[PDB]
Amino acid sequence: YTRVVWCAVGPEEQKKCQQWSQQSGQNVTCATASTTDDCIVLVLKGEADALNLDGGYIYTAGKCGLVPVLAENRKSSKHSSLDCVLRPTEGYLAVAVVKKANEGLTWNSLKDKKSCHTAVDRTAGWNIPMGLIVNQTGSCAFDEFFSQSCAPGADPKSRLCALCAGDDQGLDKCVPNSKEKYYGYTGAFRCLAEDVGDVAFVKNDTVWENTNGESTADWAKNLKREDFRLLCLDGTRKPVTEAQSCHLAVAPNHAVVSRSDRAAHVEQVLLHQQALFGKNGKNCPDKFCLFKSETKNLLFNDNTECLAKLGGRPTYEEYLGTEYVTAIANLKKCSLEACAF
Ligand SMILES: *[C@@H]1O[C@H](CO)[C@@H](O[C@@H]2O[C@H](CO)[C@@H](O[C@@H]3O[C@H](CO)[C@@H](O[C@@H]4O[C@H](CO)[C@@H](O[C@H]5O[C@H](CO)[C@@H](O[C@@H]6O[C@H](CO)[C@@H](O)[C@H](O)[C@@H]6O)[C@H](O)[C@@H]5O)[C@H](O)[C@@H]4O)[C@H](O)[C@@H]3O)[C@H](O)[C@H]2NC(C)=O)[C@H](O)[C@H]1NC(C)=O
Ligand SMILES: *[C@@H]1O[C@H](CO)[C@@H](O[C@@H]2O[C@H](CO)[C@@H](O[C@H]3O[C@H](CO[C@H]4O[C@H](CO)[C@@H](O)[C@H](O)[C@@H]4O)[C@@H](O[C@@H]4O[C@H](CO)[C@@H](O)[C@H](O)[C@@H]4O)[C@H](O)[C@@H]3O)[C@H](O)[C@H]2NC(C)=O)[C@H](O)[C@H]1NC(C)=O
Ligand SMILES: *[C@@H]1O[C@H](CO)[C@@H](O[C@@H]2O[C@H](CO)[C@@H](O)[C@H](O)[C@H]2NC(C)=O)[C@H](O)[C@H]1NC(C)=O
Ligand SMILES: C[C@@H]1O[C@@H](O)[C@@H](O)[C@H](O)[C@@H]1O
Ligand SMILES: [Fe+3]
Ligand SMILES: [Zn+2]
Ligand SMILES: [Zn+2]
C-alpha cells in the first residue's frame, strides 16, 4: 500500500510537495487543490490520502469521517525527557494583536475597526475571535462588526474581503491559500504590520517569529516586539511577553488527517518520512527539510519540531476537546450535523 498522496493547497505548497516527492523517491506524491475544503473532498474521494489541517478544518473533516493521525508538536520547556514523537502536545495561544501606537484600542473598542484574519473557519483567525464576538453582541451579524477585513474565504465582494490584496498581479483576491498576500498566520500578521488592519487574530508564536530580526522578509525586517500589544479579554493591553495571561483561548495543534481506512498506512509512512526530513533527520539540512519554507508555513508550520503520536487513539471530538467543539457548533448556528459536502 506503501505510497501516500499528499494534498497541497495552492501553487506554493504544490512546489514544496513536488520537492518532497522527488526526495522521497515517490514514496509521497502530490495532488493539488485551490482550497483546503477541496483538498478534504479529494481525501474523501480517495484521490488523495492526507494533509495537515488547522483545528477548525479538523472539525469539518471529522464530520465527514476523516480522523486525526499525527499532531504537530513544537518545542517546549516542560516534558523534555520524553522524545518529541511521544510527548503530549500543548496547544497554541490564540491572541489578538495591535500596534502599540494605536493607543486606547482595546477588546471593548474593536467595533467598526479593521481586522486581519488567517482565513474563515480557522481556529485563531476566525472561530475563537468571532465566537467570542457573537456571544458578546448576541448577534449573528459578525459580518457587520468590523468596518473592513481581510478574511480569506469570504465573499470577495463583501467587506470581509475588502482589505485582502490577492497575488503579485492582484488576482485571486481573498482566496484561502498562500497566493493571497494576507492569508494565514504570516499573512494576517503582515496585514497588521503594514497598517492595513487595526488588529490581527493570530497565535502567540507568529508575533515572535516575525519580529526582532527573526524573519528577514522585507516587510518583517524592522519589526520590533515592543511596537506591538496583545488585547486581553478584560479590556487591558499587555506586552507580547504576557501571552500566558492575555490570550483568547488555547487551540489544539494542527494535525494530519486521513480517511479512517487509510490512517494506519499514512502514519507509518509519515514517521519514516520525518526520520529522513524532520528536525534532525538524516537528510534535512543537507537535501530537504519538511518543516522549513522561509516563514511561509507551507504544508506544516515552520516551528514544528516533529509530528507526534496521539495516544488514547482519539476521535476528532476528543482531539479538539469538548471546550473547542461547542464553541464551533454555537458559532456555526449563525451560518445540526452531517457532512457539509
Ligand atoms: C510564544 O511564542 C514564542 C515563539 O514560539 C515562544 O518563545 C520560544 O520559547 C521556546 C522555549 O519554550 C524557545 O526555545 C528554546 O530556546 C532556548 C534558548 O535560546 C534554547 O536553549 C536551551 O534549550 C535547553 C533544552 O530545551 C533549555 O533547557 C530547558 O530545560 C531545562 C530543564 O532541564 C530548564 O532549564 C532550567 O533553568 C533554570 C533557571 O536557571 C535552572 O535553575 C534549572 O536547573 C533548569 O536547568 C528549562 O525549562 C529549559 O527550557 C535551556 O535552558 C536553553 O533554553 C532551547 O533549545 C529552545 O530552542 C524559543 O527560543 C522561543 N522562541 C523565540 C523566537 O523567542 C514563547 O514561549 C511563547 N509564549 C508562550 C506564553 O507560550
Ligand atoms: C458562546 O456561548 C455559548 C453559550 O453559553 C458557549 O457554549 C457553552 O459553553 C459552556 C462552557 O464550555 C458549556 O458548558 C460545558 O460545561 C458544562 C459543565 O461541565 C464541565 O464542568 C465541570 C466542572 O468544572 C467539569 O468537571 C466537567 O468535566 C465539564 O467540563 C457541561 O454540562 C454538563 O454536561 C454533561 C453532558 O455530558 C451533563 O451530564 C452534566 O450534567 C452537565 O450538564 C456542558 O456539557 C459543557 O461541556 C455549555 O454547554 C455551552 N452552552 C451551550 C448552549 O452549548 C460557548 O462556549 C461560547 N463561545 C465561546 C467562543 O466562548
Ligand atoms: C520508500 O519506501 C520504502 C518502503 O518503506 C523504503 O524501503 C525501505 O527502506 C528501509 C530503510 O532504508 C529498509 O530498511 C527497508 O528494508 C526498505 N524496504 C522496504 C521496507 O520496502 C525506502 O527507504 C523509501 N525511500 C525513501 C527515500 O523514503
Ligand atoms: C490535541 C490538542 O492539544 C492541545 O492543544 C489541547 O489543548 C487540545 O485540547 C487538543 O487535545
Ligand atoms: Fe491554527
Ligand atoms: Zn487560558
Ligand atoms: Zn477515546
Curated annotation (Swiss-Prot):
Belongs to the transferrin family. It is found in: Secreted; Cytoplasmic granule. Residues 4-333 form the Transferrin-like domain. It comes from Bos taurus (Bovine). The gene is LTF. Poly-N-acetyllactosaminic carbohydrate moiety seems to be needed for TLR4 activation. The lineage of its organism: Eukaryota, Metazoa, Chordata, Craniata, Vertebrata. Disulfide bonds join C7-C39, C17-C30, C64-C339, C84-C306, C116-C191, C140-C334, C150-C164, C161-C174, C232-C246, C284-C289. Fe(3+) 2 binds at D54, Y92, Y185, H254. It comes from the Eukaryota. Hydrogencarbonate 2 binds at T118, R122, A124, G125. Monomer. Found in a complex with LTF, CLU, EPPIN and SEMG1. Found in a complex with MPO and LTF; interacts directly with CP, allows Fe(3+) incorporation into LTF and activation of CP ferroxidase activity. This is Lactotransferrin. Transferrins are iron binding transport proteins which can bind two Fe(3+) ions in association with the binding of an anion, usually bicarbonate. Lactoferricin binds to the bacterial surface and is crucial for the bactericidal functions. Has some antiviral activity against papillomavirus infection. N-terminal region shows strong antifungal activity against C.albicans. Contains two BBXB heparin-binding consensus sequences that appear to form the predominate functional GAG-binding site. Glycans are attached at N27, N135, N204.
